[PDB]
Amino acid sequence: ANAVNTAKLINEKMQELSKNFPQGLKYQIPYDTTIFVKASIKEVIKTFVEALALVLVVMYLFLKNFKSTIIPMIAVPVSLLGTFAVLYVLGFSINLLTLFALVLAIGIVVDDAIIVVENIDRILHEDSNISVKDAAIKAMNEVSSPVISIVLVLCAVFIPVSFISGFVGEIQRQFALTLAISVAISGFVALTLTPSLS
Amino acid sequence: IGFIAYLFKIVPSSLVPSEDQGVIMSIINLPSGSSIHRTIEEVDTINKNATQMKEISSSVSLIGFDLFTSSLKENAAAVFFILKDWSQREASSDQIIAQLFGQYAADRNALSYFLNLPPIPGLSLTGGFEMYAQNKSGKDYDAIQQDVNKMLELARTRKELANVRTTLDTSFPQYKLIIDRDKMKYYNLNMQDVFNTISATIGTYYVNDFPMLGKNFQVNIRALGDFRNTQDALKNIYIRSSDNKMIPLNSFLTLVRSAGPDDVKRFNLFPAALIQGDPAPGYTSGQAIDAIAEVAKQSLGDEYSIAWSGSAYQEVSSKGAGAYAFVLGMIFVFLILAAQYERWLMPLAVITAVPFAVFGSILLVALRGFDNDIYFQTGLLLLIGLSAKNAILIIEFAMEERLKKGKSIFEAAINAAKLRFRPIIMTSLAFTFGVLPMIFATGAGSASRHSLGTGLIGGMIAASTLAIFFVPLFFYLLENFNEWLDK
Amino acid sequence: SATIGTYYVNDFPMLGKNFQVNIRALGDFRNTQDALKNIYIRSSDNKMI
Amino acid sequence: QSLGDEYSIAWSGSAYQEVSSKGAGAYAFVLGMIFVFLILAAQYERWLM
Amino acid sequence: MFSKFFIERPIFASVVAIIISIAGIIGLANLPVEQYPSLTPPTVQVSATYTGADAQTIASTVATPIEDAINGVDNMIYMDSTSSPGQMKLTVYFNIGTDPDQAAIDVNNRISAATAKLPEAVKKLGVTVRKSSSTILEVVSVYSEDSSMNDIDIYNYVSLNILDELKRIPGVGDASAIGNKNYSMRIWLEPDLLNKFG
Amino acid sequence: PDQAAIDVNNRISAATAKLPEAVKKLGVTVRKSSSTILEVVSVYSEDSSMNDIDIYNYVSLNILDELKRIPGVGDASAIGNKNYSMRIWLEPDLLNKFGVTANDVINAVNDQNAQYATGKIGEEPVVNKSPQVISITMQGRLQTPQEFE
Amino acid sequence: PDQAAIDVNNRISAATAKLPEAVKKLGVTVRKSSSTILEVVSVYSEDSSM
């Protein structure tokens, strides 16, 4: 179930009941775990927006082209939404551990987008005769195998963390599996969508 | 790498950092056997003193329930101080806890321990590990407590075993009922009848249930409170004989003052005592577990065998398969990199490029003073991933320069590093400035954010600053060695 | 059942656990077909039958 | 109209299934048309075809 | 090449991104939201009430039979019991990765056999078996700002009225009050009058 | 097998009320046991000092409880069935001589060898507040044969 | 259908205290049910002797 929606429903129903309350009787909610998850969601959203803005700034500085900033703006949300879909399918839940893991996954996603777009731009500016489509094809021929190898290496790093049992095993399994999903989706996006947009 | 090992040695490790949850859990314990009116008065004074505190918005009190041992004790109470929002109040939970300890440090009637709410559910109150000393031999609980006191005397000496405590308390006042069976039967009485009179006068007798407001509620019989508050309560109680003679209870029953356990704890079908101890600041929690285990072994008898629960059980259980999992994860990484590069030696460049991120993260956490928490381990996983990413790209470009372009090994390394320099700096700047606010995070979940952010930033700065120089060195060495074997 | 068989009345404390209390006649008094002859029961007239 | 605010109405069996499943057909139709459009844009590499 | 196929076909990459986005949005809307997942190993609590019985009496007569019966349940690591005057509290800890409902029903089936041994009062009040793996969503305090309603009145108002509405709320596993003061027809004997009237 | 055990228990719970008092008193145990011996472990005294009863009670108190916690052990029992019990050996000639019956001894043991419930002294609600709450403790169960005598 | 019975059994056993004593003595039965009447079988005597 959704903790935030349930807490909102509980508060609304408590107000409704408090309308028909005996004189002198009040209610209050001292402890509420929904506060932590709402604050964590807000912090993760702020981190995502800040990371996207910094990616746009560094892309507009190093690459000197504003139209290039559109590529991360599409690659990053697509990778994150794919990560969310895979998390829902596998049965994960939005909790503090998964939000902290998503904060890390932002780094992987922006790293992949920046890597691919920068390689495209380097090959484009190395040769004046080469066209944008030819430059994209050449750069992807260069880094298609490394991207697959990086995805496999990252997964071979993260999956064995999951097999650890115990309290620490489960806590680190949350991060490890979220990161593995993130690197898989980010690599697939960097292989398919990012070169096309570039 | 030697300095990395030293830094990992000199950085203390903790499970999860203490956090400000907005609630201060206060545990009030009066002397054992105390009435509940005394606990109510003490909790009222504690609440009225905490009203003066600006941070404490409101107080939630559970009087008559002990939180350390889940059981109803009249001498015990738990009071939760609901703090203001993080934005409103400047003082953190630790400062308010210090103030509360300061105003209640002077000797008084009640012993109040003010502790922060646990960060993650499923972790014991405070940090005391759970240990159970099962008594196979079947000794009386008063002797079990004497042996536990000997064990605590030996453990108290060691610096590793800080704040060792035992919940086994046999000092509760009790009244011992001494049945005079010869007199009981001489009076034509059955024991069950006399104990039904005792249960109906001094205790509560649940005869049956009655219907009220559409629900069944109990019907309880108990004598008036003014007739069961003294040791002489047995005087007024009368029991009918089989000879139809009223017989006072004190004729054949006696109340004798004594002391004994209020909570009798049994672990795995055996009587047990709980030992609650905290690790030393320098030693780790596992070292404290080993130390208390050895202390219990040397102090306790052969009957006492240590059984563990909770944090200690996780510590004993978790670390076993992690080593094999990480060995397999490194073997698979090596195989995948060898398949990519088509060379057995070459993946060693990426593998030796990894440790720079660990170096930077551990250096920054040691300098800031943050411990080796689990969030630090997760940050280590991310930093390992990104460092391996950069190393793989640099090595692939160096290999392509050496093979496709025919550049010399020195020239290939130079050109590969120069090519990969820009994207590495780009992503390093983006991610470092992205996670920079985590160090300066607000109150809600502050400690975890600070630890993860400081570890991540240290690792990222170290990787982007140093690994860029060192990966080409490894490629040059391994390529020269490969040329050596070809000759 | 109390004389010829074992009658399990209730438990008693020994070695920390609870152990049964059983009532039975001596082996020589439940050993033949005439075992019923020795055993008596009091009626509601207080006569041993 | 008859019972008033003191009473609420609840359904069982087929009535419950119908009342709860109102709208599923329209949701499926909309999603199907969207996915048909996306697949056809993919195959023919044009947006307006 | 794999990447060249998407570079030459921007619409195909775009619709792949759109489908990934739609799946991600669906999963995000349907993702469970919690504070922390089931990191702690599952536990089952067994409670029996022997009113007026001392801790030793409870430990020997109620705690020992139930503990002996529960011993042997599958996937059980260790079992702990605390006996206090009036009440017996037993907590069975199960190996992490065990379904809480399977464990609870196993313990229930064992205690069903063990119940008849227990003293008459314990059987009459019953033995309560529940899973304590669930964590607290929040705490709601119903208080009387005036002195009009005692603890008893507030508790019974809460149990009769507040609790039923809150349990109907979607996503609420259960709501339980802590006061433990139900209505009861209390008969207060006066031993002086009892002796006066024989 | 777990679902099978749960189904059998659900169906048994209804009929156990109908069973005689003694049968339900001893309990009705449902186990997912194949009833075929996996292995036999023989615990014996080489000194021959410990009699059969003592060895059986030792393996019942210590060994069997540990063995039942082993995953994959459906049921672990010892053949002796020699758990300690306070055996009372009636002598029918003496019963007839003194005039008591077996039922009288049954009632006496059931009455004078049980622990009952005794409340606490000084518990609320009391108008005259007392400094302490003191629990009443009784030992109504006899422990030694010299006590049952 | 199996897991639903498990969950119902667990909740009923969790709320033992609320039940009255008579139902506890007789027992509470939780069993998978079905509204589907597969068929009705009629056994009748032809001779009308039974």
Numbering used by the authors:
A (entry chain C): 298 to 495
B (entry chain C): 546 to 1032
C (entry chain B): 744 to 792
D (entry chain A): 843 to 891
E (entry chain C): 1 to 198
F (entry chain B): 100 to 248
G (entry chain A): 100 to 149
Text of the article:
The most predominant and clinically important multidrug efflux system in C. jejuni is the CmeABC (Campylobacter multidrug efflux) pump, a tripartite system that includes an inner membrane transporter (CmeB), a periplasmic fusion protein (CmeA), and an outer membrane channel protein (CmeC). The cryo-EM images of RE-CmeB without a bound ligand permitted us to resolve the structure of apo-RE-CmeB at a nominal resolution of 3.08 Å.
We reconstituted purified RE-CmeB into lipidic nanodiscs and collected single-particle images of this pump using cryo-electron microscopy (cryo-EM). The extensive classification of the single-particle images indicated that two distinct populations of RE-CmeB coexisted in this nanodisc sample. One of these structures depicted that the trimeric RE-CmeB pump does not contain any bound ligands. Interestingly, the cryo-EM structure of RE-CmeB depicts that this multidrug efflux pump forms an asymmetric trimer in which the three protomers display distinct conformational states. Similar to the structures of asymmetric AcrB, MtrDCR103 (30, 31), AdeB, and AdeJ, the three RE-CmeB protomers in our cryo-EM structure present the “access”, “binding”, and “extrusion” conformations, respectively. The entrance of the periplasmic cleft of RE-CmeB is encompassed by the amino acids Y658, L660, R710, and D823. A similar hydrophobic patch is found in RE-CmeB, and this RE-CmeB hydrophobic patch is composed of I178, L607, and F610. The superimposition of the apo-RE-CmeB and RE-CmeB-Amp structures shows that these two trimers are similar, with an overall root-mean-square-deviation (RMSD) of 0.6 Å.
